[PDB]
Amino acid sequence: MSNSVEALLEISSSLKALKEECVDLCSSVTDGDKVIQSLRLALTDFHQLT
């Protein structure tokens, strides 16, 4: 029992520390798929212009 409780306290602390480091990653799910499409077009144009 005493070993299990100590393991919970350690993992909980590690999670709290990682969530704080990842504050910028947690914002609004803009449709990742749309950004990639747009990027695809821009790169393709860039290549053609070069």
Binding site: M1, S4, V5, L8
Partner: protein, 56 residues
């Protein structure tokens, strides 16, 4: 005749049925039974294992 609800998960024990009979006959008073109440914990080792499983 407190018709044992057949669907109660806990079936009445012979001890319980005997105690009930003794109380109905006025030979035993509920006060006498209450004063005799043993809070002795039953199955302590099984309870500890349940708590460990939850934490895990």
């Amino acid at each position: 005749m407190m018709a044992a609800n057949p669907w109660s998960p806990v079936q009445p024990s012979a001890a319980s049925l005997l105690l009930e009979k003794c109380l109905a006959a006025g030979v035993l008073s509920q006060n006498a039974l209450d004063q005799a109440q043993l809070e002795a914990p039953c199955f302590s080792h099984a309870e500890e294992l349940q708590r460990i499983t939850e934490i895990k």
